[PDB]
Design a binder for this molecule. Sequence first.
Ligand SMILES: Nc1ncnc2c1ncn2[C@@H]1O[C@H](COP(=O)(O)OP(=O)(O)O)[C@@H](O)[C@H]1O
Ligand SMILES: O=C(NC[C@H]1CCCO1)NC1CCCCC1
Ligand SMILES: [Mg+2]
Ligand SMILES: [Zn+2]
Length: 434
Amino acid sequence: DPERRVRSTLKKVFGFDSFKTPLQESATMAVVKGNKDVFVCMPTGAGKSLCYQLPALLAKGITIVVSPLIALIQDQVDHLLTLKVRVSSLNSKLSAQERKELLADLEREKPQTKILYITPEMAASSSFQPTLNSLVSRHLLSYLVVDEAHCVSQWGHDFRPDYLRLGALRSRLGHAPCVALTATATPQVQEDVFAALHLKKPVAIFKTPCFRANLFYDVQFKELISDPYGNLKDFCLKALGQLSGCGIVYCRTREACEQLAIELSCRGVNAKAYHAGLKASERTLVQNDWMEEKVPVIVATISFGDKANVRFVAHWNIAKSMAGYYQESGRAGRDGKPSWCRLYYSRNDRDQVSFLIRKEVAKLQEKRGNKASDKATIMAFDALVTFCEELGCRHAAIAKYFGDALPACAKGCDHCQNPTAVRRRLEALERSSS
Ligand SMILES: Nc1ncnc2c1ncn2[C@@H]1O[C@H](COP(=O)(O)OP(=O)(O)O)[C@@H](O)[C@H]1O
Ligand SMILES: O=C(NC[C@H]1CCCO1)NC1CCCCC1
Ligand SMILES: [Mg+2]
Ligand SMILES: [Zn+2]
C-alpha cells in the first residue's frame, strides 16, 4: 500500500490529515508510482509543492528541484527546515566553505541530503558537472523536478534562457522520472514545456479545468447605454437582492475610481474608492470596512494582498489581458452560489488600454532591445478584445484560451441565454459610427 505510506508522511512530516483537493492527491500518487512523466497545472496556492516534496521522502535516492530564484529557493528551504527534513541549496549566495561541505555530502554513498534545490544557471554550470555525473554513475537520483516550468516559454510571460538547458539534462537522467509544475495554463506554454524538457510520452497531466458553472458572464457596450452610472447602479443592486452579499467594481484610473464611488453612493448604493494614491491608514479602513460588511461595494484599482460571498465583479474598463480578466472576475462566487461577472467595454476604452500597453513595450525595447516575448503581451490583450466583440458563449471563449473542451453553459451567459439580444447589440455598435 502506497496510500498507507503517503497518508503517514502527510501527517508525521507535513501535519495534514487530508489533501486540499482530489486533484492534488491524484497528482501526488502518480509521482510516487514513478513510471511516467508528469505535468501539474494548478493555480498558485493550490499546493503544487507537496506533489513532489512528499514523494521525494518515500524514495531511496535524491530529488533535484529546479526553481528560478534564490529568494524562492530560500523560502522553500526554510519551510522544510522548520519541518525537520534534510534539505540543502546550492547557489552563488553560499560561501566556499559551506559549498565544500555540501559537495562532500553528495560524493558519499547514501548521502544525508534528501532534496537539493538548485537554480537553472547552477544546474547548467561547468563547476557542477562532476558531482552530477557521479550521482548518475551510482544510480542515486530518484527524480528531476522543474518548478515554475513555464519559464521555458516565450508565451509564458517570464522567459529565462537557462531553462532551455534543462532538456539535455533530462535525457541524461533517463532512468529517473521528471515532474514539471506551473500555474500558467495556456496550451502553447504546455506545448513549449513538453518539447523544451524532452518529456517522455504519454505524459500524465493533472490540470484544473477553468469552467465555473455558477458564474453568469455578460459584456455591455458603453456607446449604447443612455445612463451609464445608473445601469451599473441597478446591476450592483440586482446582484445583492436575493440586502445580501458584497461586490467589486474594477477600473484603471484614480480619478474614475473616486467618481465611480461618488456616483454609486449618490444614487442608492454605498461605495468607497480604493487606490495607491490615498494613505495607508485610509487603505486599511476601506479594506476592513468591506471585509466585515459595513460598506457593501468597494471601487478599486489594485488588489488587497480571500472572500466567500462576492455576488458580483464588474469591470468598468477592459483589463490588460485575458489572464488578467479571468483572475479578477474569478474573485466572484467562491461560496458556489450564483454570482454575476460583467465587463463594460467600449472602443475608446480599448484604444486607451491598447496605447498604454505599447508605450510600456517601447520602454522595455529602449532598455534591452527587441524580444520575441513582447508579442505574447500583445496577443494576451487581443484575446480579451475578441471576447468582447464576438458572438459566442462567454465560458467557451475562456475555455478555448486555456485549452479546455466545450463546457455545458446552463444558459450561464448572455449569448447562450439569448443569442439574438447579443446580435442586435453588436449590430447597433456598428451603427453608432455609421
Ligand atoms: N494537503 C494539504 N492540506 C493543507 N494545506 C496544504 C496541503 N498541501 C499544501 N498545503 C499548503 O498550501 C500552501 C500553498 O502551497 P504551495 O506548495 O506553495 O502552492 P503552489 O506552489 O501551488 O502555489 C502552503 O502553505 C502549503 O503548506
Ligand atoms: O487559473 C488561474 N487562477 C487565477 C488565480 C491567480 C490568483 C488569483 O486568481 N491562473 C492561471 C495563471 C494564468 C494563466 C493560467 C491560469
Ligand atoms: Mg510553487
Ligand atoms: Zn454560454
